[PDB]
Amino acid sequence: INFELDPMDDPTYVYMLYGVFDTVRVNQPERNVLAMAYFRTPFATGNAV
Amino acid sequence: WSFTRIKAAETPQLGAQYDVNFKYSGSIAYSDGGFYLSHTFRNMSILFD
Amino acid sequence: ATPRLQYFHIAGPGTREYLSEDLQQFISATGSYFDLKNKFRQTVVAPTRNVTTEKAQRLQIRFYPIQTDDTSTGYRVRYNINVGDGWVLDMGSTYFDIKGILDRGPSFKPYCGTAYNPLAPKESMFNNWSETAPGQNVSASGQLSNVYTNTSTTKDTTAAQVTKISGVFPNPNQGPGINPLRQVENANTGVLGRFAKSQYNYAYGAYVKPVAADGSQSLTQTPYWIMNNAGTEYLGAVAVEDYTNSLSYPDTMIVPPPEDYDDYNIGTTRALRPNYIGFRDNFINLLYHDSGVCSGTLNSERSGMNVVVELPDRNTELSYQYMLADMMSRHHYFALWNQAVDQYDPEVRVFSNDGYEEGAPSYAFNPEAVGAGEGYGPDLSQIKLYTNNTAANDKNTAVTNATTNFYFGTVPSYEIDISATQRRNFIMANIAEYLPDRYKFSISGFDATSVAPTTYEYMNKRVPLTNVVDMFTNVGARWSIDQMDNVNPFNHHRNWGLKYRSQLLGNSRYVNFHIQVPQKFFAIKNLLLLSGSYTYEWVLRKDPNMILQSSLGNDLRADGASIIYNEVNLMANFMPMDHNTSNQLELMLRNATNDQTFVDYLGAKNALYSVPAGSTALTINIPARTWEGMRGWSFTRIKAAETPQLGAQYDVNFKYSGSIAYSDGGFYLSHTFRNMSILFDTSINWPGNDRLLTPNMFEIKRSVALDTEGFTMSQCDITKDWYLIQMATNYNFVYNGYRFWPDRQYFHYDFLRNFDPMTRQGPNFALPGLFDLVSYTPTTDNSGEQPSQEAVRNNSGFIAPRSWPVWSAHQGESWPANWPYPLCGQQAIQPGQVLSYKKFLCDNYLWTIPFSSDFMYMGELTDLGQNPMYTNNSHSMVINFELDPMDDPTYVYMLYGVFDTVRVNQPERNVLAMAYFRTPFATGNAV
């Protein structure tokens, strides 16, 4: 991505937002068993440890 | 990973036939183990994607 | 297992299974002289499966207290360690993250000497200015350094500098600024200076806090003119500042002369005794261990019974010290658990007086090479230089203007022998200053009974006697000063461990400490908790004497020391191992046939038997018992002043902050044991088979002067019997020959590394000569004068008077020394006029006697501990001691040999049950 901006007078960020499906489905099979699976379609965070 | 910071003046150009900017004759922390700037490291983040 | 990786043996099979079988035999056969094993690579492959969860799991969990309930004596914290299924927790990784505010009190000098004018002579003065009223009767003495090359006989050159006086311009740092002082003329130079109006004029340690950002110790500077006897001639100017109320002497004390010399003498100024108030080794005495009244509490939820029971007769802190020292050498400094062992200076304890490094005559010469210091010889200040006539061999031409300096003789110098000067400074500050109070005296301004003998300024304001130890004290003998053989050597500013432990907190007494304290109770020191919810509360000491260690042993409570705990959190590390295996691991650990078992490393019941000052004997009778697995005996004597009340919430009679030899391994009284006896029944001696050369007693030492039959080994007064006992116990080979055992030198608590025999000879007094001109008894009067010390006449004119405090200015005249009778040389005293003083010191040892039939280690459960004459049959032993009589109440720290074990059983989830068992002393009562 290449941006061209009007020069401002102080350091500014460029708040960039992609489009992601950061969805979670909650599995509760039995009593006091709570499990969540997080998945984000463009930008996932699975490190396979 | 393994990392420290070394001064530019105290390190020759890598794979250089003759480093002309090298005007230092002390302990080359890159060559021997004379590491002394393992501090001055505040934090670190690794992102495989 | 990529073939690319396998070809280079990165993920391949391995060396043993891919090399030709003949080659493996070859490289193994020729592996002692032609090694080829480094030329065929092999890589160890990680398990990469079923060993770690991909589940998002915290690697390191912080536990913060549910309940605190702070009180004035302790600081309780109650945690709640939730360990889910698939989580397995090791309490070896559990510790207390403690951060708070520490006040180490004014009795805390992190540095020897002072920080203010250290190079200044002790009896110097900072440009005196003493007046009754401004402009009235004034006395002033100081150096006038700055110059302004004034044209005199008028104010213009002087008043210009006087207008600058009101600022920082006098600038005491800058001097004349001329290197040849001979070139300056007396009438065209000008004089400037800066004098101070204050009480207690001492340059050494003088501190005046600044009031401006550019020096400027004062805001008002009244200028005074300097003129000769006539008021017409202008000579110089003076700046005067009022330091009467702005002056202070931190980290320094005034050492005044005796009362008869108080007037017309200001004495000297000495820096206060250095004191390090850091935490103790391994954070000893920071958790309420060994206390059954204020113990900790760890228990589960389903099993509400507490599984941490503490007895007042065990020793958690000392057990850790022995466990850690056996685990690793103690010279390693691990700042995390504050692992810095208490170590004195070996050159200070056993004072090897080797005289001094006598070198060539060394002098201090003038700043230039020209001068007439003590100007003997012709003046030559008015000479005239004439040219020579080589033909007439005489003067021919006078030099017109020969401005010549031309003094006589060699370079004017003052002689010093540094190797002897530093030697006496080493002796009289690292050794003399730590003498017992009975060898000290007040400083003519200090009075006893005004403050407790355990306060900082009591120790500072009591100068030791100067003849009890000095350069001539056993001048050729490696001999620990018998006047301090019973003085705690770890309470010394050379205690490098405490020196490091105090400097980890900072150079100030206002420390925002953040420390991590390990758990040390043996049942939970290495407990590997399985799944479940556990609550684990523990209470922390707030006693400054307990938690903090001084290098002087003064009462920290009386010295304003205090601590405040802000946050105390519990850190735990959890292995992210696969839940498919950690539940397996926790299930093979819930199985009762394989459950954790923990023993206290010390394995010794701890009994403290009081021994008063004058007493020399102690009887230890015990009720009838079975001794079913006893390991043996260990014993030293600990001063009662240095030992806290056992199992006490807060000891009020404990007013000592040095090294508690009970808690740590800082033993220093392993000597002063004449002998000991053991009788399991009323009359049945335990050795009782003529094992020893004295079969009815364990004669630890006997006097060599009274010796006739021998019974003294290792060139000291320790006995043949006792020496064999120690070597057999620690090293397991005495019947094959005595030898040194380097394999246990790291242990820091074994025999050979710290068994130090020494020998001196000494003149034989109570003879026609040999008058014993050294007095050891101070006059204990208010005046700082000790005339009984003035009989030695050694270093007569070059040191302060022996009656005076040592740190006063020198005075007197050169005079032949008379005290030290020459024990050697061709002018030595007669061979019948000398004696022998065979002696040994053995620090950090704690004499051990094994309950083994041959005194050699043959297993933890000893030879006779399973002998079914004691195990089956009750016995009531009596242990009889005779000791060298000290001058202060002491205990005798008797350690038995016990098997204190725990079988930690966790049959279900969060069902925690510990069973305690101690073999000889199962009841754990006061014995």
Chain-centre distance of CA C515, in angstroms?
21
Nearest residue to C792 (alpha-carbon basis) of C469, C480, C368, C550: C469
Residue bearing tokens 């010191």: C841
- Provide the token pair at C611: 């021994």
Q: Tell me whether C54 touches chain A (CB under 8 Å).
A: yes
Q: Which of C54, C57, C583, C910 to mutate to test the interface with A (most CBs of A within 10 A)?
A: C54
Residue bearing tokens 């250089």: B16
Half-sphere exposure of residue B48: CA atoms within 13 angstroms, side-chain side: 7
CA dist C661 to A26, C176, C491, C668, C891, Å? 59, 58, 11, 8, 11
Rounded CA-CA distance C494/C496 in Å is 6
- Provide the token pair at C94: 């559990």
Rounded CA-CA distance C212/C166 in Å is 14
- Name C268's bridge partners: C255
Rounded CA-CA distance C91/C307 in Å is 14
Chains touching chain A through at least 3 C-beta pairs below 8 angstroms are B, C
Helix (H, G, I), strand (E, B) or coil at C621: strand
Contacts of C852 (CB under 8 A, 6+ apart): C632, C858, C862, C863, C864
Rounded CA-CA distance C301/C80 in Å is 10
- What b/e string do you get for C44-82 counting C-beta neighbours within 10 Å, with b at 16 or more? eeeeeeeebbeeebeeebebebeeeeeeeebbbbbbbbe
Q: Which amino acid is at C235?
A: L
Q: Tell me whether B18 touches chain A (CB under 8 Å).
A: no
Phi, psi of C130 (to 5 degrees): -115, 120
Q: Are C114 and C252 in contact (CB under 8 A)?
A: yes
Burial class (CB in 10 A: 0-12, 13-18, 19+), B26: exposed
Chains touching chain C through at least 3 C-beta pairs below 8 angstroms are A
Q: Are C51 and C576 in contact (CB under 8 A)?
A: no
Number of other residues whose CB lies within 10 A of the CB of residue C516: 15
Helix (H, G, I), strand (E, B) or coil at C677: strand
Chains touching chain B through at least 3 C-beta pairs below 8 angstroms are A
CA dist C164 to A30, C154, C506, Å? 90, 17, 41
Q: Tell me whether C576 touches chain A (CB under 8 Å).
A: yes
Burial class (CB in 10 A: 0-12, 13-18, 19+), C511: buried
Instruction: Name every chain A residue with its beta carbon within 8 A of the beta carbon of B47.
Output: none
Rounded CA-CA distance C399/C709 in Å is 90
- Name C60's bridge partners: C573
Instruction: Name every chain C residue with its beta carbon within 8 A of the beta carbon of A49.
Output: 52-54, 576
Q: Tell me whether A49 touches chain B (CB under 8 Å).
A: no
First to last CA, chain A: 32
Rounded CA-CA distance C765/C363 in Å is 39
Nearest residue to C604 (alpha-carbon basis) of C578, C632, C575, C636: C632
CA dist C240 to C135, C160, C244, C453, Å? 11, 17, 12, 42
Chain-centre distance of CA C359, in angstroms?
32
Test C52 with A48 for CB contact under 8 angstroms. Answer: no
A to C CB pairs, distance under 8 Å: 7
Nearest residue to C456 (alpha-carbon basis) of C106, C147, C835, C180: C106
Contacts of C744 (CB under 8 A, 6+ apart): C730, C731, C750, C752, C753
Residue of C nearest to A37 (CA): C55
CA dist C314 to C305, C625, C643, C674, C899, Å? 21, 18, 15, 27, 11
Q: Which amino acid is at C679?
A: L
Helices (H) and strands (E) in chain C, counts: 13, 38
Nearest residue to C649 (alpha-carbon basis) of C517, C543, C562: C543
Instruction: Name every chain A residue with its beta carbon within 8 A of the beta carbon of B49.
Output: 43-44
Rounded CA-CA distance C505/C674 in Å is 42
Number of other residues whose CB lies within 10 A of the CB of residue C305: 10
Angle at C424 between CA C423 and CA C428, to 5 degrees: 125
Strands (E) across C625-781 are located at 632-639, 675-679, 755-758
Q: Do chains A and C touch (3 or more CB pairs under 8 A)?
A: yes
Q: How close does chain A come to B46, measured CA to CA in Å?
A: 11
Phi/psi class of residue B26: alpha, beta or left (left: φ > 0; alpha: ψ in -120 to 50)? beta
Phi, psi of C425 (to 5 degrees): -65, -40
Instruction: Name every chain C residue with its beta carbon within 8 A of the beta carbon of A48.
Output: 54
DSSP secondary-structure letter at C334?
Answer: B
Q: How many residues does chain A have?
A: 49
Test C53 with A49 for CB contact under 8 angstroms. Answer: yes
Test B48 with A47 for CB contact under 8 angstroms. Answer: yes
Instruction: Name every chain A residue with its beta carbon within 8 A of the beta carbon of B48.
Output: 47
Q: Which amino acid is at B21?
A: N
Angle at C712 between CA C708 and CA C713, to 5 degrees: 150
Query: Residue C28: which H helix or E strand, with range?
Result: helix C21-29
Residue of A nearest to C577 (CA): A49
Phi, psi of C215 (to 5 degrees): 55, -110
Q: Tell me whether A47 touches chain B (CB under 8 Å).
A: yes
Q: Tell me whether A49 touches chain C (CB under 8 Å).
A: yes
Residue of A nearest to C576 (CA): A49
Helix (H, G, I), strand (E, B) or coil at C26: helix
Mark which residues 24-43 of A lie under 8 Å from B by CB: 43
Nearest residue to C563 (alpha-carbon basis) of C30, C70, C150: C70
Signed CA dihedral, C878, C882, C886, C892: sign only:
negative
The experimental resolution of this structure, in angstroms, equals 3.4
Helix (H, G, I), strand (E, B) or coil at C864: coil
Instruction: Name every chain A residue with its beta carbon within 8 A of the beta carbon of B46.
Output: none
Q: How close does chain A come to B12, measured CA to CA in Å?
A: 36
- Provide the token pair at C842: 């053995």
Angle at C526 between CA C521 and CA C531, to 5 degrees: 115
Question: Please, which experimental method was used?
Answer: cryo-EM
Signed CA dihedral, C328, C329, C335, C339: sign only:
positive
Q: Which of B45, B46, B47, B49 to mutate to test the interface with A (most CBs of A within 10 A)?
A: B49
DSSP secondary-structure letter at C717?
Answer: S
Rounded CA-CA distance C190/C170 in Å is 13
Helix (H, G, I), strand (E, B) or coil at C585: helix
CA dist C473 to C426, C431, C470, C832, Å? 13, 11, 5, 21
Q: How close does chain A come to B43, measured CA to CA in Å?
A: 20
Q: How close does chain A come to B49, measured CA to CA in Å?
A: 8
Phi, psi of C16 (to 5 degrees): -65, -20
Q: Are C271 and C253 in contact (CB under 8 A)?
A: yes
Instruction: Name every chain A residue with its beta carbon within 8 A of the beta carbon of C909.
Output: none
Rounded CA-CA distance C786/C86 in Å is 76
Rounded CA-CA distance C200/B41 in Å is 51
- Provide the token pair at C264: 């017309």
Nearest residue to C208 (alpha-carbon basis) of C118, C116, C105: C116
Instruction: Name every chain A residue with its beta carbon within 8 A of the beta carbon of C576.
Output: 49
Burial class (CB in 10 A: 0-12, 13-18, 19+), A46: exposed
Rounded CA-CA distance C68/C66 in Å is 7
Rounded CA-CA distance C588/C582 in Å is 10
CA dist C541 to C66, C240, C496, C545, C569, Å? 19, 53, 25, 10, 16
- Provide the token pair at C35: 């090694």
Rounded CA-CA distance C754/C843 in Å is 6
Q: How close does chain C come to A35, measured CA to CA in Å?
A: 10
Residue of B nearest to A43 (CA): B49
CA dist A49 to A46, C43, C50, Å? 9, 21, 11
Contacts of C84 (CB under 8 A, 6+ apart): C531
Signed CA dihedral, A14, A15, A21, A26: sign only:
positive
